[PDB]
């Protein structure tokens, strides 16, 4: 009875960052060496535990969130960051216990005529709270005269398309990101090693 990481990391389709996917992992044993054997392929930063010790640990839930961002935006996937992504798409707590894994995905997600399939939110009333998702597509009101659900002058579509070509300099290229969150609450533990 094993934990289904291959379903997150070997997924050929990945979510857009504004509608990021979450898989919940529980009721299994988590072999973190399946992930650490593959380290030439991702970048990886951990927060609140060490990478090596992960097998040793036990938690009440493990969460895996996945999405695609631009490379120079990977640095916002970290505690206490700001910018479009950290504030309007995906937000980590300050007390984040977990790992942020990322790999360059030019070859998978760029296309000579651009790939516009991946979206981000650029306007919102307020900065998301941690682990919050906004799928809403309703017109953001800038300016005073209110929009009637009609984009136009001072009224925007809140979602915007990345445009990915294989020519772009790294960091204007697409990166797949998996955020692993370790959550040890007060009920009985369920994920171990």
């Amino acid at each position, epitope marked *: 009875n094993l934990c289904p990481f291959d379903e997150v990391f070997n997924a*050929t389709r990945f979510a857009s960052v504004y509608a990021w996917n979450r898989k919940r992992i529980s009721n299994c044993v988590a072999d973190y060496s399946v992930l650490y054997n593959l380290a030439p392929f991702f970048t990886f930063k951990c927060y609140g535990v060490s990478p090596t010790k992960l097998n040793d640990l036990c938690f009440t839930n493990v969460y895996a969130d996945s999405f695609v961002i631009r490379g120079d935006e990977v640095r916002q996937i970290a505690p206490g960051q700001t910018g479009n992504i950290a504030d309007y798409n995906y937000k980590l707590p300050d007390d984040f216990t977990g790992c942020v894994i990322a790999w360059n995905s030019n070859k998978l997600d760029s296309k000579v005529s651009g790939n516009y399939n991946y979206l981000y939110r650029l306007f919102r009333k307020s900065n998301l709270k941690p682990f919050e998702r906004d799928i809403s597509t309703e017109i953001y009101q800038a300016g005073n005269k209110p929009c009637n659900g009609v984009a136009g002058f001072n009224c925007y579509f809140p979602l915007r398309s990345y445009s990915f070509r294989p020519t772009y300099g790294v960091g204007h290229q697409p990166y797949r990101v998996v955020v692993l969150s370790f959550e040890l609450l007060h009920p009985a533990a369920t994920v171990c090693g």
Partner: antibody
Framework: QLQLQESGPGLVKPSETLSLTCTVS??????????WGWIRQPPGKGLEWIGS???????YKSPPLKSRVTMSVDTSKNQFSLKVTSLTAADTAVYYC??????????????????WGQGTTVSVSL | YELTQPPSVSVSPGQTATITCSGT??????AYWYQQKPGQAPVLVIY???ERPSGIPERFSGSTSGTTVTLTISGVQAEDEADYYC??????????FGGGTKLTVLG
């Protein structure tokens, strides 16, 4: 000009074991984006993937058949092989050599099965 | 793990055909479409959800929406009579093919 050609017997006895060989022409079997695989089709029925293999010997195997499938890459002679133990009637099919165009580490079908051999008919009878 | 696909679709000439394919892991994995004509190797007509390889006519186009993907063959010709296979992969990354749909050009 990537083309593929299956070799292999046409008749095999039940229980015996099946041996297939695909030769690659027009490209190196070491193409970093190539996952060489086998798909079969029982006469009258639909396609079934058996397994794929990278130029390193990394082998992806269908779960129904994992127990009795083996594959190998002859880097020297630009070809890959399939072996299926304990044939039964249910193993009668056309067997297709194919190239999955994908990307490392494990996207062995990312861009689809875009180039196919044209099949070797395999027939499992006593 | 199983992709579900109508056994037969029939279409008047010059008109437009819809092959749907449903499977619970299409949220995780792209769809692929292969065309097979009698006694012959399958031919990839759609990779990832909607990419058309080079020598494939524009009337083939792929579409996704949830746990269903669809091949759409605009302006059907007689040559388009074939067997069409959707292909994806299960929760793990295991390739799986649908059952296939005969496309009959009526009239």
């Amino acid at each position: 000009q990537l083309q593929l050609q299956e070799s292999g017997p046409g008749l095999v006895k039940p229980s015996e074991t099946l041996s297939l060989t695909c030769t690659v022409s027009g490209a190196s079997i070491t193409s970093s984006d190539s996952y060489w695989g086998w798909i079969r089709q029982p006469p009258g029925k639909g396609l079934e993937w058996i397994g794929s293999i990278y130029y390193t010997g990394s082998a992806y195997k269908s779960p129904p058949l994992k127990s009795r499938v083996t594959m190998s890459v002859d880097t020297s002679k630009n070809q890959f092989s399939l072996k299926v133990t304990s044939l039964t009637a249910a193993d009668t099919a056309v067997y297709y050599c194919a190239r999955g165009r994908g990307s490392p580490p494990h996207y062995y079908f990312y861009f689809g099965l875009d180039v196919w051999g044209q099949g070797t008919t395999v027939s499992v009878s006593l | 793990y199983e992709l579900t696909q109508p056994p037969s679709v029939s279409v008047s000439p010059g008109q437009t055909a819809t092959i749907t394919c449903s499977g619970t892991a299409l949220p995780n994995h792209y769809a692929y479409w292969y065309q097979q004509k009698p006694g012959q190797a399958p031919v990839l007509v759609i990779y990832t959800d909607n990419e058309r390889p080079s020598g494939i006519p524009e009337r083939f186009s792929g579409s996704t929406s949830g746990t269903t993907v669809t091949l759409t063959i605009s302006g059907v010709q007689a040559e388009d009579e074939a067997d069409y296979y959707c292909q994806s992969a299960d929760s793990n990354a295991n390739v799986v093919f649908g059952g296939g749909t005969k496309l009959t050009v009526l009239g």
